[PDB]
Design a protein around this ligand. Structure first.
Ligand code: HEM
Ligand code: HEM
Ligand SMILES: Cc1cc(N)nc(C[C@H]2CNC[C@H]2OCCC/C=C/c2cccc(F)c2)c1
Ligand SMILES: Cc1cc(N)nc(C[C@H]2CNC[C@H]2OCCC/C=C/c2cccc(F)c2)c1
Ligand SMILES: C[C@H](O)[C@H](O)[C@H]1CNc2nc(N)[nH]c(=O)c2N1
Ligand SMILES: C[C@H](O)[C@H](O)[C@H]1CNc2nc(N)[nH]c(=O)c2N1
Ligand SMILES: [Zn+2]
Lengths: 407, 411
């Protein structure tokens, strides 16, 4: 019932009790581990509300106080009456920070308590959503000195009036299917790049076209907006030693900003809640640039390096991979845009693990996601046992809105 | 029921029904996933059902389920259990069983090879000298002057738990580690404690960086005994780099034969506590883990120093750069000396093909993603993008506690 996690490099053992406050189900059983699968009423609401406010009042050292009991009744009153309730500003801020703190797949949670929360619950239209989003981008970008933030649109009501950002991230590059048969730009976004065009967007049809935002207020048809280019910080990619690297014509954006998730606080659902931090180098240089079904640039780079590409065992893919990732880090650093390498990030997360065990009784962690996609075993998280479980408040996946929207 | 796994690079979707034949526990529940946890005397009562499940599987595999021969063998095993408390496997059942423990090993990326396994039956063995002889023969057969062949040697099963056959070595061939008074280590740091056991048992330690450890062998629950493998039987490879001529001067070498000797083989409820098996290496086991863990040889600094990498900031990726050069060196050296090795690209590609064939012909393939994905360059190998189901089939290999923890010393 109390579970231990060992670090095999340091022999440090931590004891996990936080898992017993676990609520939702993992996907695993006693017979099958599902650890590597990407996606495994008034009556329901008050328990959920109570559980949250209980931890809220505990956090501000006021568990069992008049104020605690008072608010528990006010919320109970409001649910019995309206079928929902509203969070106090303070509860919203605490819930958002905690959803991040509970994200078992996020290596960057050492930062969880520095999060700027933008309350957009007063928003009513897509133009409104656009204004809120530009302001988030500008704030968070901070001319290259990136700052974490989330903007929270109005909560679900009857589920026929959802606020949704249709983009998967606030800033992403377009993908187009070519007659040719190959793909121009980012193949991840082909479908969406079409939906934008199937709605009037004028595609420059380049390798790196910043997608328009596609915004849905109150369950209405969504609308297109170009983000002002002066608000999209981008970095040209060059290598500190290979003069030819620049001629690849690669660039990436400075701000990672996930916009398709659902934030759950105290039973309430915030279906539009874009949030942003700063990149770990490998996200761009390993995944965005080198995945088979992403930009897939390994061959081109290997060639320019004149490596022996005739056999897998020359490790030419591995050599090219390192150089590409050196380029990404060097570039962002040179243009003074915040970035972290996987060494410093995983080291940070280990420190964060020790803090959460020391201070909260544990830290839910998903090893499959936490371990970087390159050089796994020379980063300390490789050797660290982790326990994965689901705590609330949380971020959750949700079906892409086009599959669902009533037009 | 039916479960789906998707490959997110290819969109290929596979259906698992084999997990319905799973018995043992994973360690996970609906409320916690223990997927990254490293380690998560029987009675007649429990034995005949376990015998029965196993023989139903053997007999279906040979298309004689329900045969007279199947039924007579059930009755025969039944009777042997009630009369003697245990039973003996026929040669054919033993072979089949050891192959399936390998087939079912969900942490093993090499399983495409599962059906080509040389089985050596050492169940007539009685003494530690007998074990030494059996192991030498295994090592010579498997080595095959560099053209590695997979093999397993199987010593008598557990009886009462007081008479166990054990190989005390974690692998048949490994290098000594020696803790020095100044707190530094000579040789392999993983093997310090075991080296100390060997020394106190009477081993005269050469005390260099690559001293092949003696075998410590326990027969029939008796105190274990020391033996030196004839050095002409221990194939080793000096490590050099195709472009870097200073690489050889680091003084590195490794052995060709990876041979796990500390696991337990369970077949139809029988427990074989000494069952050394061997295959051939994936280069990253040596180049990433053996040489580059901080708790192992830890050569990253020395290598990057010679490479003149910018070592002042991790963001130069000096570690990543050196790591790749060491792994190039390992594969180059083995290939140049004609010792079988596979790179992590070719081994993970073979595994996806094996895994898909297994879904098509068997209804599933249990696989542990934490173990299957290589410890460098993970996402450029096709396994990274492969959804996997982990579960426990028997026959199987299992961990067992190190025998210096449990053994009752006799003298
Ligand atoms: C401050 C710098 C941050 C770093 C370096 C970072 C790091 C990462 C990384 C590397 C991933 C893996 C993503 C992938 O591989 O596709 C990830 C996932 C995630 N992060 Fe962060 N993060 C940061 C800030 C944030 C913030 C501000 C939030 C929310 C407030 C957040 C919440 C999440 C969530 C929910 C996931 C998993 C999403 C999913 O399941 O697809 N992180 N994080
Ligand atoms: C033929 C070449 C083989 C290759 C390339 C190979 C590859 C590997 C690798 C890389 C590992 C993980 C090692 C680690 O990370 O420490 C492993 C684990 C394992 N393999 Fe193989 N393997 C081979 C043959 C075999 C054979 C012959 C058997 C037994 C019949 C076997 C059974 C196992 C088992 C039981 C594990 C898990 C060990 C543990 O949990 O500590 N493999 N395999
Ligand atoms: C706030 C933040 C900071 C950071 N450094 N990285 C991130 C993650 C961002 C940046 N890189 C990928 C993106 O993660 C989004 C999740 C990607 C997973 C793929 C995926 C998820 C669901 C369905 C599907 F088909 C694919 C977020
Ligand atoms: C038959 C076979 C073939 C092959 N290529 N590799 C292997 C695995 C071999 C070769 N390299 C590491 C070794 O695996 C050892 C397995 C045990 C895992 C290590 C381990 C487990 C618990 C605590 C600990 F400190 C270490 C076996
Ligand atoms: C199948 C597997 O679960 C999938 O490929 C995962 C593996 N680990 C990951 N880890 C991170 N950080 N991001 C990912 O997209 C993935 N993909
Ligand atoms: C804690 C974690 O489970 C442990 O370090 C695992 C991770 N994956 C591994 N994978 C392989 N192949 N070998 C290992 O020793 C490990 N170690
Ligand atoms: Zn699990």
């Amino acid at each position: 019932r109390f579970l231990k996690v060992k670090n095999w490099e340091t022999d440090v053992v931590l004891t996990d009790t936080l898992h017993l406050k676990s609520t939702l189900e993992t996907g695993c059983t006693e017979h099958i581990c599902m650890g590597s699968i990407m996606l495994p009423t008034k009556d329901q609401l008050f328990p959920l509300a109570k559980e949250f406010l209980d931890q809220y009042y505990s956090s501000i050292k006021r568990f069992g106080s008049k104020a605690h009991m008072d608010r528990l009744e006010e919320v109970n009153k409001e649910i019995e009456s309206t079928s929902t309730y509203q969070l106090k500003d303070t509860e919203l801020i605490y819930g958002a920070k905690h959803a991040w703190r509970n994200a078992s797949r996020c290596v960057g949670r050492i930062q969880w308590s520095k999060l700027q929360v933008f309350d957009a619950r007063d928003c009513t239209t897509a133009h409104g959503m656009f204004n809120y989003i530009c302001n988030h981008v500008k704030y968070a970008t901070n001319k290259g000195n990136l700052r974490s933030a989330i903007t929270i649109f109005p909560q679900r009501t009857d589920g026929k009036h959802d606020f949704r950002v249709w983009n998967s991230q606030l800033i992403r590059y377009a993908g187009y299917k070519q007659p040719d048969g190959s793909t121009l730009g980012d193949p991840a976004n082909v479908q969406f790049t079409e939906i934008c065009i199937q709605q009037g967007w004028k595609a420059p049809r380049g390798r790196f076209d910043v997608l328009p935002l596609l915004l849905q207020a109150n369950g209405n048809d969504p609308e297109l907006f170009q983000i002002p280019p002066e608000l999209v910080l981008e970095v040209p990619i060059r290598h500190p030693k290979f003069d030819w690297f620049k001629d690849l014509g690669l660039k990436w954006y400075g701000l990672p900003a996930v916009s398709n998730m659902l934030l759950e606080i105290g039973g309430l659902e915030f279906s539009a809640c874009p949030f942003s931090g700063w990149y770990m180098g490998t996200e761009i240089g390993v995944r965005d640039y080198c995945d088979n079904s992403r930009y897939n640039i390994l061959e081109e780079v290997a060639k320019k390096m004149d490596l022996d590409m005739r056999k897998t065992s020359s490790l030419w893919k591995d050599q090219a991979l390192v150089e590409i990732n050196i380029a990404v880090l060097y570039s962002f650093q040179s243009d003074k845009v915040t970035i972290v390498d996987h060494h410093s990030a995983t080291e940070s997360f280990i420190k964060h693990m020790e803090n959460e065990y020391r201070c909260r009784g544990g830290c839910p962690a998903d090893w499959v996601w936490i371990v970087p996609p390159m050089s796994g075993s020379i980063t300390p998280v490789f050797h660290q046992e982790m326990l994965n479980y689901r705590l609330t408040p949380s971020f959750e996946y949700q079906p892409d809105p086009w599959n669902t929207h009533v037009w």
